[PDB]
Amino acid sequence: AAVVLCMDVGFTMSNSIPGIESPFEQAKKVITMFVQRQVFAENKDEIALVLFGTDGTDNPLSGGDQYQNITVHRHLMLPDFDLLEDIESKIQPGSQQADFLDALIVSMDVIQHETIGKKFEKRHIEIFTDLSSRFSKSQLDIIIHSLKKCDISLQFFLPFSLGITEQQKEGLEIVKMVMISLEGEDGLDEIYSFSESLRKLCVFKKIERHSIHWPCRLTIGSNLSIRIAAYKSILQERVKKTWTVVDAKTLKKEDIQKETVYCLTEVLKEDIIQGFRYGSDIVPFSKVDEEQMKYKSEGKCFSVLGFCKSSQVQRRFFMGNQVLKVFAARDDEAAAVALSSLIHALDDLDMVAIVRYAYDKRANPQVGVAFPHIKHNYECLVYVQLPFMEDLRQYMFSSLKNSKKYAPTEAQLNAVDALIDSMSLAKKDEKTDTLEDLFPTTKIPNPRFQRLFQCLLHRALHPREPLPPIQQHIWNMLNPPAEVTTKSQIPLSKIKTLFPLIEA
């Protein structure tokens, strides 16, 4: 995808109400936060920057008085910290006025001439302006035809949401007409304000990985086989890149070496033998002898051992570090019908399937549960690993219900009941038990990656400063909404005076 940012640096954006930040500053902030997301989310996208309204003129097209006061500050290339430095420092407001239609002409010229030799699935042009520059509409027809031919999308970012001068009102008329002529009536939803754009770009792009296609066959016995496809659905995501150890005086990873040594006091690597502990004794156990005596299994098995009631498989026994979603084989109507029958049969009987799962011939076989998961767009089985006999810890804890010492009174129970009502994180709506979540905790990006990217970005731009504190907006999304905290001020006070807590 190729993105071209067309920003206005005209004189009209320099001055505004002193009670609010200048639109030039807001556009600069929006563009900077967009580049930060692209840099730390390596996706091979190309970004080009075009400025109109500056004193200098630098365009492939010059002609006469037209196509002037516009500069192609940055060509079409991968984003980098050089762009961030140039945006922060080099870019300064101008003093001239330029037609944003003419700037749109140059943006097409940049995106058309510099796209040769490369394949782009999408093409976008972003316009940052306040529509306060006098201009003449005399070419609109050829632009609309050009965009429909080149298949390039547009977005507009105005300092006001969709007390303005008629020039802005008149300028709004053309941009409304353009969006209608390009992408219909819902094109009205593709015009944004600097405030809401700032809100949507306050966080870094979430780490995304593509689950691989894992084909297998769901076997029930020997004469029944269903072709299935499994993908990893939920897992503990890790960082894409790890830290690299480099020398402190040259900053090179090739100038250091990591090695292991064995002492009894010096032993060579070829004079050691693998061994195992058997009680108080040590027995030699050769690695080559191990693989001869290792458990051997035929890999890639998805076999149903049997079906049991859903209530017999408690959620607290789930093990493993992944959740698999099992779909039918791609482009297979016969397999889709067969798998659908199994899913609906399990759901109607409220049963689950106990299956044996092995990733491949090098994988340890597993025993898990496959329960139906039916939605209005798709249906599939969900596989979660189940524990073995050796993985269960049989601990015993003293009971609390029949304890005289720790029996709460009726007054203490009432105080706790009041707290739970006040600290509710969900609300019923429409009188139809429609529970909406006031704190989903599932749409929240992981704060670990947000903090890490903030420190990396700060160090790169300012290599001689300490790490900044955690961003305020990070804390806000890690805390419940303010109305929840306010409502619990009184019930929490009652608990503090009713439950005597003493630290020994």
Partner: peptide
């Protein structure tokens, strides 16, 4: 639907 600057 996120597209353009938001994707």
């Amino acid at each position: 639907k996120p597209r353009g600057l938001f994707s």
